[PDB]
């Protein structure tokens, strides 16, 4: 299962990176794969669907009044855009919390765009600027509204992230031995389970909003795992940003998928059962994940957005927003375009 | 064969990268490896001091008389630091030429450092700030050395590209259809050759400079290595800047090594006769390329300090200047220690 993206110069091979994918149903079958699987994968920020759901289902959470655009934030890695720290600091007065309460911290932005403002400025980036600050007030929501105690919401024997590790594997249909455990680059504990299983969990994201399209009755877990869908796909400069990858491909398909990236090449996509769904051989929705065993985010993009073409997903006209992460521009300092990308891989069913 | 370097978080794998690497001796056998020795590889700027060779060897070129930091920034990826910018000012005063005459374009600097300075300060970079800029410069000087015109030095039609190749080739041992060609970030023709041929290139800069320094009989292309050799330790800091591997590496080890990276992540580092050499078991100079499959820089020097630390070349004194390149820092954005690097090949020797 050699499946390779592939750097040229001039049709000599700069670089080669090796690609895992799953496309599961809405079960979780495995139909398609590319590479490994069942790769064992830190899902990283891939996972924030899982942590909106494990705040949503925390009693006395709904007291807050938090939004759509709020829900979107939960789940997002931002580019720390000043609609975002805006927003995050909104949501901190909703549960009578300060910045002094995060226990996440700055970085320079995702967008390279806001982060030269930020240098042209001298911006020192704090805590609400962090690209998870959402998921984090989220989580001292929870905190407090079970009387957990703030201090610590992000360690894991709170109670809160007992409850983050029990909700992460209950939708990965895993053991808890199953499931391990690091701490992220927001200073949460972040999950690794096999790829395959990340796909099922957006395949049950997908399935629920199809459920409540449709009138059907349904748990509380698919109530809020609808909820969540519809926030990302109503709010998806929220989940990132201008120019970023997952609002420009969610914007695309106008509702029909959510998608999230996570850090070091992970990506992750539910898609509403359809005409492509059917054609691909599921009467469900459906899972897309996606690793790039060495990290590079711009082959990920590249290979995501080759990965959907293959399945059919959308049409040449949606999927052409998105040309620029498909086909990288590869232009030398003097305008000369000096190579490409290419996808040696071949889906298996 | 499947020899990796691998990040964790917590001990759970994180990315794994593929390593290829070869350690020659003076005449390019092989000593030691990983991955894919001889993986046909774009050599990109560690092609550079083959390049200055070609330079320096080309008629009319001393009467310019260009130095040996002038010489040290022919053979640099620079961090266009305001010093590297004055020296391709100077070096264009050399051969009566203007910025106006160079052939490459300006770019986000290697260092954040100097690129956060730009952007506070709305700087567009320009020509003379290209990271190659010493390399362009150089052969506008041969250009108009022999009378080519300065128009197009660039162009592989151009006689300064036709003797680039030719020296590429000959210093690689290699044919000229055994080396294939692209274009580069700086717009001029780039190398590629197998991996091997570039460690090969270095174990000769090493060996040139040893036999000059032991002053036998040398031809004047190996007293033009043993120059550039030279130039390129006494002033690494002309070959990329403050706080870049290279430049920490030559100074770390005071004139035992020269070393110089290639974009997407390939190393080269020729290595003067030592005892850590006579212990690897060859009588001379040595040779050592390493290419990371993907393309990682931080995968890239975290793995050629492991490897000189396995090869023994340096003292554990030494190489603790490169601590924080060997094991790269992994601390979240709150201070915690998240995960780390490890090395999970082994040397294979013969
Ligand atoms: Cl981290």
Not at 153 to 177: F, I, S
Not at 199 to 226: M, N, P
Not at 313 to 321: K, L, T
Request: hydrophobic share 40%; glycine share 12%.
């Amino acid at each position: 299962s050699e499946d390779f993206v592939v750097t040229d110069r001039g049709g000599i091979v700069e670089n080669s990176h090796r690609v895992h994918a799953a496309v599961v149903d809405a079960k979780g079958r495995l139909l398609y794969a590319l590479g490994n699987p069942t790769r064992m994968t830190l899902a990283r920020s891939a996972a924030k669907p899982a942590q909106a759901l494990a705040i949503l289902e925390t009693e006395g959470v709904a007291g807050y009044g938090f939004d759509d655009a709020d829900i979107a934030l939960m789940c997002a890695s931002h580019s720390s855009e000043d609609r975002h720290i805006a927003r995050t600091r909104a949501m901190l007065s909703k549960i009578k919390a300060e910045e002094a309460d995060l226990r996440c911290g700055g970085h320079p932005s995702l967008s390279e765009m806001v982060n030269r403002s930020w240098i042209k400025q001298d911006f020192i980036p704090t805590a609400v600027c962090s690209n998870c600050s959402g998921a984090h007030v989220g989580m001292l929501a929870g905190a407090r509204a079970i009387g957990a105690g703030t201090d610590g919401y992000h360690l894991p024997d709170h109670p809160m992230q007992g409850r983050v590790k029990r909700t992460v594997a209950e939708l990965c249909d895993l053991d808890a031995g199953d499931v391990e455990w690091g701490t992220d680059g927001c200073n949460l504990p972040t999950p690794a389970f096999p790829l395959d299983r990340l796909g099922r969990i957006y395949a049950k994201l997908a399935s629920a909003a199809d459920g409540s399209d449709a009138g059907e009755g349904q748990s509380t877990r698919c109530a809020a795992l609808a909820h969540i869908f519809r926030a990302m796909a109503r709010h998806p400069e929220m989940v990132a940003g201008e120019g970023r990858y997952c609002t420009m491909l969610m914007r695309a398909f106008d509702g029909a998928l959510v998608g999230k990236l996570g850090a070091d090449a992970s990506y992750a996509i539910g898609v509403r059962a359809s005409d492509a769904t059917r054609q691909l051989g599921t009467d469900g929705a459906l899972g897309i994940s996606v690793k790039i065993e060495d990290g590079n985010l711009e082959m990920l993009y590249a290979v995501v957005t080759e990965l959907l073409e293959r399945l059919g997903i959308g049409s040449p006209d949606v999927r052409s927003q998105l040309a620029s992460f498909h086909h990288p521009q590869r232009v030398n300092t003097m305008g000369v375009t000096t190579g490409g990308v290419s996808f040696p891989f071949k889906l298996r069913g």
